[PDB]
C-alpha cells in the first residue's frame, strides 16, 4: 500500500535570475497503513539538498511542506497522503541544464518500515 | 569554494597560429551567496600572459570573462562558472608556458586561491 511519485513540474524555467519561488519537482508519498512520518534523503550528486546538471552545476532545493534536519527533509504526517513541491528560491541565478535530483524516501513508525529511491530531472532552458 | 585550473588537451605546435587555440580551462564554484569572480594574473603572468622558461610572453584571451585593465572578472551568481582561455589567431608561438594567477570570489572578496598550470607548445 506504500507508493511514491516524484516528477519534475510542468512550469517552464529559463536561465537567469528568478523573480519568484519557482517549482521544480513534485513529490507524493502515500500509505493508508499506520505510520508516523516520512524522510526524504538526498543521494549521490544531490547530497546537500541540490538538483545537479550534467556539468555539475548545483541548485538548492526548498520545500514549504517538509522540515529539515542537517542533511535531509522529514515530516511527522500520519495521513494517507503527503504532497510536497520542491521549488527554487527567488533571486537564484540559474544556468541552463538538465538538473537531476536523486534521493531515497523512507516511511517510519512510532523505525523505517518502507523505503524507495526517487529520481527526476528538470530542464532549465537557455 | 573550489577552483580547478588545467592545461587543455589540444596539441599546439610552434609557429604562427591560424585560428584561436584553447590553452587552459578554469572552473570556479561556490554554493555560497556571491556576486562574481576575479581572475588576477600574478608573477610573470601579470598582463594576462603565459610565459615560457626562456621568457617568451604569450597573450591569453577568454570569451567567458570580462577584462578590466589587468585582470578578468565576471558577475555570476550561479554556483558555478567555467572559462576557456585561448591563444589568438595570428600569434607567433615558440616551449613550456606557465600561467600563474589568483581566483577571487566577491560579494569585497570572500574567498581566494592561487591557480597555476603549464601548457606545452611543441616544435
Curated annotation (Swiss-Prot), chain A:
<comment type="subunit">
    <text>Forms a homomer composed of subunits assembled in a large structure resistant to proteases and chaotropic agents.</text>
</comment>
<comment type="function">
    <text>Major pilus subunit. Expressed only in pathogenic serotypes, it is part of myf, a probable virulence factor.</text>
</comment>
<keyword id="KW-0732">Signal</keyword>
<dbReference type="GO" id="GO:0009289">
    <property type="term" value="C:pilus"/>
</dbReference>
<keyword id="KW-0281">Fimbrium</keyword>
<keyword id="KW-0843">Virulence</keyword>
<protein>
    <recommendedName>
        <fullName>Fimbrial protein MyfA</fullName>
    </recommendedName>
</protein>
UniProtKB/Swiss-Prot annotation, chain B:
<comment type="function">
    <text>Major pilus subunit. Expressed only in pathogenic serotypes, it is part of myf, a probable virulence factor.</text>
</comment>
<comment type="subunit">
    <text>Forms a homomer composed of subunits assembled in a large structure resistant to proteases and chaotropic agents.</text>
</comment>
<keyword id="KW-0281">Fimbrium</keyword>
<keyword id="KW-0843">Virulence</keyword>
<keyword id="KW-0732">Signal</keyword>
<protein>
    <recommendedName>
        <fullName>Fimbrial protein MyfA</fullName>
    </recommendedName>
</protein>
<dbReference type="GO" id="GO:0009289">
    <property type="term" value="C:pilus"/>
</dbReference>
